[PDB]
Amino acid sequence: ANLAAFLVLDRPEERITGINDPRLRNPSDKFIYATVKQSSVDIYFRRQVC
Amino acid sequence: DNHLSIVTLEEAPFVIVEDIDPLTETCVRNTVPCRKFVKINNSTNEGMNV
């Protein structure tokens, strides 16, 4: 039973499906992600108050 | 009577007022400006309206 439980929880992580993934919405130390500096990406993120 | 003064405190996740970006612009888009007294010394009560 313990081996079966470990095997069914053996999945490391599930691939992010997009910006609506709850994992990205709450960044933590276990999963770190960031931009470079001031990419059209940073400008877009500036106007997103959410 | 048009200018209705509003008092607000920043202690809960309902106001995320921060500094402004020194890029020859007021601040981020679609955001109303405010002001806050800043204390210089523990004895002096003079505070600039930044």
Curated annotation (Swiss-Prot), chain A:
List of residues binding glycine: 40
Post-translational modification: NMDA is probably regulated by C-terminal phosphorylation of an isoform of GRIN1 by PKC. Its phosphorylated state is influenced by the formation of the NMDAR-PPP2CB complex and the NMDAR channel activity.
Sugar attachment sites: 26
Impact upon substituting residue 7 to Q: In NDHMSD; likely pathogenic; changed glutamate-gated calcium ion channel activity; mutant channels are activated at 10-fold lower glutamate concentrations and 13-fold lower glycine concentrations
Outcome when changing residue 14 to K: In NDHMSD; this mutation produces a significant increase in NMDA receptor-induced calcium currents; excessive calcium influx through NMDA receptor could lead to excitotoxic neuronal cell damage
Subcellular location as annotated: Cell membrane; Postsynaptic cell membrane; Postsynaptic density membrane; Synaptic cell membrane
Top-rank taxon, per record: Eukaryota
Function of the molecule: Component of N-methyl-D-aspartate (NMDA) receptors (NMDARs) that function as heterotetrameric, ligand-gated cation channels with high calcium permeability and voltage-dependent block by Mg(2+). NMDARs participate in synaptic plasticity for learning and memory formation by contributing to the long-term potentiation (LTP). Channel activation requires binding of the neurotransmitter L-glutamate to the GluN2 subunit, glycine or D-serine binding to the GluN1 subunit, plus membrane depolarization to eliminate channel inhibition by Mg(2+).
Disease annotated for this entry: Neurodevelopmental disorder with or without hyperkinetic movements and seizures, autosomal dominant: An autosomal dominant neurodevelopmental disorder characterized by severe intellectual disability and developmental delay, absent speech, muscular hypotonia, dyskinesia, and hyperkinetic movements. Cortical blindness, cerebral atrophy, and seizures are present in some patients.
Family according to the record: Belongs to the glutamate-gated ion channel (TC 1.A.10.1) family. NR1/GRIN1 subfamily.
Entry's free-text remark on domains: A hydrophobic region that gives rise to the prediction of a transmembrane span does not cross the membrane, but is part of a discontinuously helical region that dips into the membrane and is probably part of the pore and of the selectivity filter. The extracellular N-terminal domain (NTD) is a site of allosteric regulation to modulate overall receptor function.
UniProt name for this protein: Glutamate receptor ionotropic, NMDA 1
Curated annotation (Swiss-Prot), chain B:
Subunit structure: Heterotetramer. Forms heterotetrameric channels composed of two GluN1/zeta subunits (GRIN1), and two identical GluN2/epsilon subunits (GRIN2A, GRIN2B, GRIN2C or GRIN2D) or GluN3 subunits (GRIN3A or GRIN3B) (in vitro). Can also form heterotetrameric channels that contain at least two GluN1 subunits and at least two different GluN2 subunits (or a combination of one GluN2 and one GluN3 subunits) (in vitro). In vivo, the subunit composition may depend on the expression levels of the different subunits. Found in a complex with GRIN1, GRIN3A and PPP2CB. Found in a complex with GRIN1 and GRIN3B.
Disease involvement: Epilepsy, focal, with speech disorder and with or without impaired intellectual development: An autosomal dominant, highly variable neurologic disorder. Features range from severe early-onset seizures associated with delayed psychomotor development, persistent speech difficulties, and intellectual disability to a more benign entity characterized by childhood onset of mild or asymptomatic seizures associated with transient speech difficulties followed by remission of seizures in adolescence and normal psychomotor development. Rare genetic variations in GRIN2A may be associated with susceptibility to schizophrenia, a severe psychiatric disorder characterized by hallucinations, delusions, disorganized speech and behavior, cognitive impairment, and social withdrawal.
Effect of residue 34 to R: In FESD; severely decreased function in ion transmembrane transport when expressed in Xenopus oocytes; severely reduced localization to the cell membrane; changed glutamate-gated calcium ion channel activity characterized by increased glutamate potency and decreased glycine potency
Residues of the full protein shown: 403 to 452 of 1464
Compartment(s) of residence: Cell projection, Dendritic spine; Cell membrane; Synapse; Postsynaptic cell membrane
Glycosylation sites: 41-42
Protein name per the record: Glutamate receptor ionotropic, NMDA 2A
Function: Component of N-methyl-D-aspartate (NMDA) receptors (NMDARs) that function as heterotetrameric, ligand-gated cation channels with high calcium permeability and voltage-dependent block by Mg(2+). NMDARs participate in synaptic plasticity for learning and memory formation by contributing to the slow phase of excitatory postsynaptic current, long-term synaptic potentiation, and learning.
Family: Belongs to the glutamate-gated ion channel (TC 1.A.10.1) family. NR2A/GRIN2A subfamily.
Superkingdom to which the source organism belongs: Eukaryota
